């Protein structure tokens, strides 16, 4: 007997935008 | 204005339209550090130890959002040391200041943080952190001579140098007494 856990790929989309002058 | 803050720094504001405003001293979920940004995700996930949810689809209307002009800003090289030794929020430049005026502003203040008999190792470690970006070879050297006075033995050399520093006035005094003997003893040999 030998139980194991194999990792399987995935992903989450992340958009980013700027803030001119930090305002 | 500049102000010293505690590390690690994390600030996350949930916006009403369903995005998040992030400013953080460290990376998470691919968000770059130090520069702020408006963040949106296509599927619920945990970032900076809290849940960033996917927003509800919206209908597009005519916008009235402002678009500010962009702006490059040059700061003094040692802004971190200037903000630290004030212990309050302090003015460091103007938007439209010259290289010359900007520098001649904390220079006298900064020069008078000189080496002392009582914290040479702690001083030498500041000089390294200040020199690292300019001359990395020198930094690594200074850092070494720092840890030698602090760490090697039980810091006995640090102790020895600290003590020989404070004795300087006594040593001169003795030195002067030796000359006054030597001169007389020499003159009282010549026929």
């Amino acid at each position: 007997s030998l139980r194991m856990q194999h990792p399987v790929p995935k992903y989450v989309e992340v958009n980013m935008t700027s803030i001119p002058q930090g305002v | 204005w500049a102000e010293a803050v505690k590390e690690p720094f994390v600030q996350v504001n949930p916006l009403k339209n369903g995005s998040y405003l992030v400013l953080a001293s460290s990376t998470d979920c691919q968000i770059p550090p130090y520069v702020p940004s408006i963040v949106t995700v296509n599927e619920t996930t945990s970032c900076f130890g809290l849940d960033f949810k996917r927003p509800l689809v919206a209908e597009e209307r005519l916008s009235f959002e402002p678009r500010l002009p962009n702006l490059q800003l040059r700061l003094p090289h040692l802004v971190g040391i200037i903000a630290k030794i004030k212990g309050i929020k302090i003015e460091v430049t103007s938007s439209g200041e010259s290289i010359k005026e900007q520098i001649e502003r904390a220079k006298a203040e900064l020069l008078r943080l000189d080496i002392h008999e009582g914290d040479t190792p702690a001083w030498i470690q500041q000089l390294a952190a200040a020199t690292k970006d300019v001359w990395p070879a020198a930094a690594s050297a200074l850092q070494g001579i720092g840890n030698f006075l602090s760490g090697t033995a039980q810091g006995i050399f640090g102790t020895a140098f600290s003590l020989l520093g404070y004795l300087k006035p006594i040593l001169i005094g003795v030195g002067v007494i030796l000359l006054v003997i030597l001169i007389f003893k020499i003159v009282s040999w010549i026929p």
């Binding site: 002058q21 | 520069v35 800003l73 040692l78």
Partner: protein, 58 residues
């Protein structure tokens, strides 16, 4: 006796040279560390422009 007298002489010379070198090593360290600090103060500092795309890490 002659060896003991010679030893005393040679010891004193090495003891003198020992100090006169330490005087020169400390003196040179104070001069160089203080100049570098002066140069560190007058270097050009960082630039910030609020551009996120510029700071992307893959």
């Amino acid at each position: 006796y002659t060896c003991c007298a010679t030893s005393s002489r040679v010891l004193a010379w090495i003891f003198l040279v020992c100090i006169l070198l330490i005087i020169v090593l400390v003196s040179c360290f104070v001069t160089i560390s203080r100049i570098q600090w002066n140069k560190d103060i007058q270097v050009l500092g960082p630039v910030i422009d609020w551009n996120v795309t510029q700071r992307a890490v893959y």
